[PDB]
Design goal:
The structure is a homodimer of 286-residue chains.
Chain A (H helix, E strand, L loop, with lengths): L6 E5 L9 H14 L3 E5 L8 H10 L3 E8 L10 H20 L4 E9 L9 H19 L4 E5 L12 H11 L4 E6 H7 L5 H6 L3 E6 L14 H10 L5 E4 L11 H4 L10 H15 L2
Parallel strand pairs in A: 1-2, 1-8, 2-3, 3-4, 4-5, 5-6, 6-7, 7-8
Bound molecules: D-psicose (PSJ) (2 copies) and manganese (II) ion (MN) (2 copies).
């Protein structure tokens, strides 16, 4: 495992629907302006990013970067189609290479399956293939000082693991020192028996955190018990990335946004949303 | 409005994944054993139901019945395909006919669209088509002394309306005396700004309630603020059906369960779950 620090990040889609040269500048300037330690770049297509341009922007605004992604049908590492697993491995290697080039140390999100709504439950083979793929990815990432954090998401976004408890059982089959649990308050709000159980169970295996309101809008205007969740992080003295994550129809990534079913306009002002979110988080943690 | 009374029901999928002679009896016996006033039949294919058999079962167990359903792609009344909208009209008419033959008074659930994930946001055409289909259904239902209740569901299950406030605007566009809002605590837990606002706004327009835990499991083992929700119902003196709704991989309807992404086992003992649920509800609204 590679060093983790308590640091606060903003998800790219708070600012930019695309990672164009302009999109990258807007989002990096945005996160820096709001007082975030890092930007979390969504690498659903890790070939599209101009890596040298982004590195220059990170230097220019004195900002760090981590990376999240979700696979697609074409790159689903759970697939019993070996060719599809191989495309997944390839995308995950490229995502790792981009992260390393940007000086990042965390590759997180739905990296262990296709992000979206499976029409049926995962077979034993689906899970086994995901475990093996996360073993190959962890081993690849280990050579480049990178930790992987598997994001537990709700039933509409994966059929592999929907609770931190399920994630930990999975991580125990993976059995890699640089593979961690990634929890997200939005997803926890749906799946978890309260906001503390999985955090307490994870302890040092909790490698990465997403802060999202129940509707993914303004923090504290929804149903997420943040009092409970932040008390739990304290009880294990969590010291790792915490990125604010929010999706509004105002800022749209043609794939990610429709996959995430973001039908509603829950905000318009990126800077106001991100500014208030960071104040909300730091008032309750750190 | 056709008569509504404060009464408690169990959703069929608490007991049975099919509506065969054996499945119908298992669900109706289960509801009766737990002391529910009614069973809610999941009528996703209303041509499947043996109506005489079910009517006999309802007599045998001294139980009333309401029906919920979700449309599918082939019967989507939001569709810009007039043949698909027509198929929707036909299925909802058949559903109404079944409910009428069972002496039921409530057709509820996702009757206004295809239950599931849409590839993009609903157009004003999609919504207009839905409102007009719900007008036609309400008028057909009214001839048979049946109320319809529009169930607001989360972003992964509809693009038409995800909050009670959105539900009420759709409802008033329908503009029919026997059309009502249907709220579900599980969906509210995701989309709503607290558990009171939509209920207080709805008042007499709220015609049907589903009680589901955040994870659709045992009541009071999740994240739903039931205290706030039940306080709000009291404020508006809600006197309508209240269905306990829960899904576990323990009991599978091979269509509905997969559509609802029930990957996890949240319970194994139907009678324990249903019994404890009713006690939980009557303790807070009895
Ligand atoms: O919560 C999420 C999706 O619902 C994750 O943050 C995303 O899958 C991913 O991180 C986006 O890049
Ligand atoms: O909660 C629901 C689905 O998530 C609705 O009640 C269902 O679509 C339907 O009513 C089940 O029959
Ligand atoms: Mn997340
Ligand atoms: Mn429901």
């Amino acid at each position: 495992a590679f060093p983790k620090r308590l640091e606060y990040g903003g998800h790219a889609l708070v600012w930019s629907g695309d990672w164009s040269a302009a999109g990258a500048r807007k989002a990096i300037a945005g996160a820096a302006r709001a007082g975030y330690d890092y930007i979390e770049i969504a690498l659903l297509d890790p070939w599209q990013i101009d890596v040298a341009l982004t590195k220059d922007l990170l230097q220019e605004y004195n900002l760090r970067a981590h990376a999240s992604l979700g696979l697609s049908a074409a790159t689903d590492v759970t697939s019993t189609d070996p060719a599809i697993v191989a495309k997944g491995d390839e995308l995950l290697r490229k995502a790792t290479d981009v992260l390393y080039a940007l000086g990042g140390s965390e590759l997180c999100g739905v990296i262990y399956c296709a992000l979206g709504k499976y029409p049926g439950p995962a077979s034993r083979e689906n899970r086994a293939n995901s475990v093996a793929a996360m073993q190959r990815l962890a081993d690849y990432a280990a050579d480049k000082g990178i930790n992987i954090d598997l994001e537990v998401v709700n039933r509409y976004e994966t059929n592999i693991m929907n609770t931190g408890l399920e994630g930990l059982a999975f991580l125990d089959e993976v059995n890699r020192p640089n593979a961690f649990l990634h929890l997200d308050t939005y997803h926890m709000n749906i799946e978890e028996n309260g906001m503390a159980k999985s955090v307490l169970a994870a302890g040092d295996r909790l490698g990465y955190v997403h802060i999202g309101e129940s509707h993914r809008g303004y923090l504290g205007t929804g149903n997420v018990d943040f009092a409970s969740f932040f008390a739990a992080l304290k009880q294990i003295d969590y010291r790792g990335p915490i990125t604010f994550e929010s999706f509004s129809s105002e800022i749209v990534d043609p794939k990610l946004s429709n996959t995430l079913c973001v039908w509603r306009n829950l905000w318009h002002d990126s800077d106001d949303l991100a500014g208030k979110a960071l104040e909300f988080i730091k008032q309750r943690y750190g």
